[PDB]
Design a protein around this nucleic acid. Structure first.
Ligand SMILES: [Mg+2]
Ligand SMILES: [Mg+2]
Ligand SMILES: [Mg+2]
Ligand SMILES: [Mg+2]
Ligand SMILES: [Mg+2]
Ligand SMILES: [Mg+2]
Ligand SMILES: [Mg+2]
Ligand SMILES: [Mg+2]
Ligand SMILES: [Mg+2]
Ligand SMILES: [Mg+2]
Ligand SMILES: [Mg+2]
Ligand SMILES: [Mg+2]
Ligand SMILES: [Mg+2]
Ligand SMILES: [Mg+2]
Ligand SMILES: [Mg+2]
Ligand SMILES: [Mg+2]
Ligand SMILES: [Mg+2]
Ligand SMILES: [Mg+2]
Ligand SMILES: [Mg+2]
Ligand SMILES: [Mg+2]
Ligand SMILES: [Mg+2]
Ligand SMILES: [Mg+2]
Ligand SMILES: [Mg+2]
Ligand SMILES: [Mg+2]
Lengths: 60, 67, 258, 144, 184
RNA sequence: GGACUUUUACUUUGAAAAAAUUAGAGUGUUCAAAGCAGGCGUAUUGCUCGAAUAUAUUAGCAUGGAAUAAUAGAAUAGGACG
RNA sequence: AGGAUAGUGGCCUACCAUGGUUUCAACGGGUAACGGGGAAUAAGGGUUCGAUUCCGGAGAGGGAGCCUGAGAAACGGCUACCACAUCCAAGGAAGGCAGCAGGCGCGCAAAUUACCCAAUCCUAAUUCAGGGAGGUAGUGACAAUAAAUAACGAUACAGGGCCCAUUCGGGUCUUGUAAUUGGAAUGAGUACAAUGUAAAUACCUUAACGAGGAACAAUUGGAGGGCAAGUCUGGUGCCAGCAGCCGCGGUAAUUCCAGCUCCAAUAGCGUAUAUUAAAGUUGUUGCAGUUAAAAAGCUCGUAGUUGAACUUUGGGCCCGGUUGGCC
């Protein structure tokens, strides 16, 4: 069976990916404040309620 | 804050019944300076190896040191 | 293994000592004495954990070695001397007198007694025999040997002991209508006025026992200690006098006096 | 009467019948025969250290066209030869040869998992450094 | 060879990890009561499960039973003492009918919010954590305190704290130092 | 004390079944896991509640029941009462 | 019957008999088997584990033997042999860490050659001495408990009623967003002190200092389904790789590598292995057997399991307990 192969191709895509450096964002709070902001982002500010309240929409 | 207190009838009774650590904590007695436990045990184990006073052994080895 | 044990770990001690499960790996093993170590109370735990007169075994030893405490008239300057049922403890300092009796929960109570009551104790005879040269003798529950008893004193009777000399003042027999103390088992601590006993020749003679509130139960003959006839006892009973209140009426009384 | 005995004095029959029909199982028979203790490379352990012999380009099963980049490794305690699949992309360039690797099961309890024909183990650490930390370059490989 | 310290777990994770009903219900609870994890809700549901199990195995026994009478009265008394169970409801089935918001309504966080010294449950949380509270005359910095229905008459600010006097405070003293520098 | 005394199984109650652990009563470890502590006074001399209870198989022991399932008896009457 | 034992006993010896166990599982083998109290998971029943804090055994490298002593077949006591192994001026001598630290190995896998008898207890001739038993501290994300990582304002937009119902003007009271801005609050962390403790280190107290973000910055795993959360962007092009399972990838990838966003749990999260529930896929409760796996070819038949009905019932008369019942 094919026990051989092209071992020169290991890491091909991981090497070919252009290095995109992470943008620096405002610090997101941790803990009770985070649960508070999730509660506001889901319930009182229900901003995206499109038909059945999707969470991560596509830009359309 | 909450603790435990003891008054005695005299400092004689206090010094015959209170522990020495609390006495030296109050500064009534002096904490005797002692060698460490390892050194005390090593001295005891060294003295276990001699039978008697050991003065005869000491003078015999001080004689035999030259030969 | 290989000989007698000299230690006693905590969680292996008898539970009626009320030794806390924390604060040390070991328990004070009672030395050999007049009582079994299970039905005993060392003077260390009696002085420290029941009376709070000391905080350490060092302080208990400091009390004992100056011959302050004496039990049954003898000084007994041993830290782990087994004090058992109905042993009297005299503290001439504070002129206090205790008698080791069980409370109804099954533990030893701090039953302060007077001096005329501390001048004696009761003993349950365990065997009557003929010693050497035909001398008759009895053996009480605390291992006391008393020679030349009254010939009517048979086994499972109670003798009153002079406690200065080892003589017998008088004695209580064993039959129906006698006030008893239960010393052993589930009903340890109750006081219940024998109605009758069943024999079962071959082991464990049972006795039926009904308290002042007519609540009957049954006990082996090993755990019964007759302390007089119905009504008057020969000793001072502790608080409660062995009723064994249920938990309901107990919390009712706790809500009554609060 | 539904087969089995129902009498009040027939517990022994039910016990031995249940014993035989318990032997008819898989996990019970395996646990009692001790195939992990006898016929397993790991000897019943969760992980095992070994010495890398070589690098294999094991083909995936059908329908899947890929090369899975596994290694041949000889276990230290048994001396048994074992094929272990090096998980992530480019991590074959960390395990070169005569490396002292840690292996674990793959999660299928001794079965070949997916499209990889006949391997049962994955590499976790190489030279005392974990492969995911090496892949995210939180650390780097030691001397040799 | 010493007696081992006893310990226990105080919560239990649910069986199904991801279901939207439980998820958004407990998120509403956490948002309304100012909690930081689902672990508090899990702990409260664990205590409620134990209480309901005790009520179930007491109700399996008939009435006039001493164990049922004793421990049912004890449990009812402990619940009406903490105030999770109203005084009229003392029939051992409302104990089964309780829910976790009844328990969460007795925490010191929401009790401070109801007393109005906070204006928000998160303000109550940080106040309790920053020791500006005294349930009797003793500071408590645990929000899950379960006040005992007699302490609300004594919930107030701590005497050795700002909003209780006796010292202004750290950054207040700092600002006094900076304005004394500007005074110079 | 006796003379004899059909045998069990089953079931009730009770004795016994170490403590720790488990369940569970009480109790401000500051909450809690815990622990078995503590609490109350004129605090100047002191007083006082506790540290329960339940479960802990089977086997063995005593006890009430006597349905259910077995067992034996007076039939070549060397049977009972007397 | 005798010896021996502290004593019973084929425990041993002499003589004599042919007995004793077993399908109700003897005997033998295996145990990755010290037993139990107990532990995990459990609607109930149950299944699995229990080297390990308590009890009871057995052992001191493998066997054997023995002195002393009340108590040992003792090993931090000797004697011999076997296996390892130490020092020698080679004649000889001394060995037993499955005690406390610690060191090699073995491994997937487990800490300081610290301080002290101050507590808990123990031993002695004994208040006083001793105790790596024990306690204290150090390492310690084995597990558990509690619980920070921000709160509240004012300004700028966008709502919902209500005063005006005077064009769409103010908007009171609002619930969110801000390359808007403020004073407060606080502990982590240092630290005089005191407390703490045998002496300390910590904890609880507490002077003084100690938030404004680029700080004092929360991770782990994932976003096709199961199963919470992308038809967003770039790269690759059945390659690299992902994927517990179904499956994704062959030039428009919601599954790969990245960025952005979002989701779940959170000082914890994932992975492997084993086990429990799920599993009524071990079925006593409680499985299935015509065709999916499974009625022996048929009958007899012992052990085993099970086994028809039948023997004092009914009627009365009283007594006294519990729950009620206005009173
Ligand atoms: Mg002793
Ligand atoms: Mg039957
Ligand atoms: Mg029977
Ligand atoms: Mg003989
Ligand atoms: Mg014979
Ligand atoms: Mg073994
Ligand atoms: Mg042991
Ligand atoms: Mg031995
Ligand atoms: Mg060894
Ligand atoms: Mg030996
Ligand atoms: Mg040794
Ligand atoms: Mg060692
Ligand atoms: Mg992430
Ligand atoms: Mg991924
Ligand atoms: Mg979804
Ligand atoms: Mg396929
Ligand atoms: Mg996916
Ligand atoms: Mg992605
Ligand atoms: Mg089920
Ligand atoms: Mg089936
Ligand atoms: Mg078929
Ligand atoms: Mg057929
Ligand atoms: Mg048959
Ligand atoms: Mg039959």
């Amino acid at each position: 069976a094919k026990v051989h192969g092209s071992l020169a191709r290991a890491g091909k895509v991981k090497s070919q990916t252009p290095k995109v450096e992470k943008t620096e964002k405002p610090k997101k709070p941790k803990g009770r404040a985070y649960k508070r902001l999730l509660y506001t982002r889901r319930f009182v500010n229900v901003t995206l309620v499109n038909g059945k309240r999707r969470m991560n929409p596509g830009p359309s | 804050s909450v603790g435990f207190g003891l008054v005695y009838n005299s400092v004689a009774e206090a010094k015959k019944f209170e522990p020495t650590y609390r006495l030296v904590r109050y500064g009534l007695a002096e904490k005797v300076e002692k060698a460490s436990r390892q050194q005390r045990k090593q001295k005891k184990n060294r003295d276990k190896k001699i039978f008697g006073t050991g003065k005869r052994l000491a003078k015999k080895v001080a004689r035999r040191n030259a030969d | 293994a290989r000989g007698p044990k000299k230690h006693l770990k905590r969680l292996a001690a008898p539970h009626h000592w009320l030794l806390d499960k924390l604060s040390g790996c070991y328990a004070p093993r009672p030395s050999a004495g007049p009582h079994k170590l299970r039905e005993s109370l060392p003077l260390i735990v009696f002085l420290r954990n029941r009376l709070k007169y000391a905080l350490n075994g060092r302080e208990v030893k400091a009390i004992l070695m100056q011959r302050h405490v004496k039990v049954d008239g003898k000084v007994r300057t041993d830290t782990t001397y087994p004090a058992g049922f109905m042993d009297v403890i005299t503290l001439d300092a504070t002129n206090e007198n205790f008698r080791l009796v069980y409370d109804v929960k099954g533990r030893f109570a701090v039953h302060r007694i007077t001096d005329e009551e501390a001048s004696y104790k009761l003993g349950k005879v365990k065997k009557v025999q003929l010693g050497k040269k035909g001398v008759p003798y009895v053996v009480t529950h605390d291992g006391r040997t008393i020679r030349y008893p009254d010939p009517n004193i048979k086994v499972n009777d109670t003798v009153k002991i002079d406690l200065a000399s080892g003589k017998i003042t008088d004695f209580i027999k064993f039959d129906a209508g006698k006030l008893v103390y239960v010393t052993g088992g589930r009903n340890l601590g109750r006081i219940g006025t024998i109605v009758h006993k069943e024999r079962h020749d071959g082991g464990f003679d049972l006795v039926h026992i009904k308290d002042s509130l007519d609540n009957t139960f049954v006990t082996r003959l090993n755990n019964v200690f007759v302390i007089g006839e119905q009504g008057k006892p020969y000793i001072s009973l502790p608080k409660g006098k062995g009723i064994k209140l249920s938990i309901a009426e107990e919390r009712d009384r706790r809500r009554a006096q609060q | 009467g539904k087969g089995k005995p129902r009498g009040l004095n027939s517990a022994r029959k039910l016990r031995v019948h249940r014993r035989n029909n318990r032997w008819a199982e898989n996990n019970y028979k395996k646990r009692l025969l001790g195939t992990a203790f006898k016929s397993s490379p790991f000897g019943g352990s969760s992980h095992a250290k070994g010495i890398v012999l070589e690098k294999l380009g094991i083909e995936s099963k059908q329908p899947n066209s890929a090369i899975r980049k596994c290694v041949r490794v000889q276990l230290i305690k048994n001396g048994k030869k074992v094929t272990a699949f090096v998980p992530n992309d480019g991590c074959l360039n960390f395990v070169d040869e005569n490396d002292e690797v840690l292996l674990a099961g793959f999660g299928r309890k001794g079965k070949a998992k997916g499209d990889i024909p006949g391997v049962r183990f994955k590499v976790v650490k190489v030279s005392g450094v974990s492969l995911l930390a090496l892949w995210k370059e939180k650390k780097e490989k030691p001397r040799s | 060879p010493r007696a081992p310290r006893t310990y226990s777990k105080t919560y239990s994770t649910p069986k199904r990890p991801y279901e939207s009903s439980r998820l958004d219900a407990e998120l509403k609870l956490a948002g309304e009561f100012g909690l930081k994890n689902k672990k508090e809700i899990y702990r409260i549901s664990f205590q409620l499960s134990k209480i309901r199990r005790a009520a179930r195995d007491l109700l399996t026994r008939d009435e006039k039973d001493p164990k049922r009478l004793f421990e049912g009265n004890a449990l009812i008394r402990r619940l009406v003492r903490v105030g999770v169970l109203s005084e009229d409801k003392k029939k051992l089935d409302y104990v089964l009918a309780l829910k976790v918001e009844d328990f969460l309504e007795r925490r010191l966080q929401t009790q401070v919010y109801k007393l109005g010294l906070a204006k928000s449950v998160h303000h109550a949380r940080v106040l309790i954590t920053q020791r500006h509270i005294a349930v009797g005359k003793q500071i408590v910095n645990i929000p899950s305190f379960m006040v005992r229905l007699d302490s609300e008459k004594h919930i107030d600010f701590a005497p050795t704290s700002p909003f209780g006097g006796a010292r202004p405070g750290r950054v207040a003293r700092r600002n006094a130092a900076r304005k004394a520098e500007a005074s110079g």
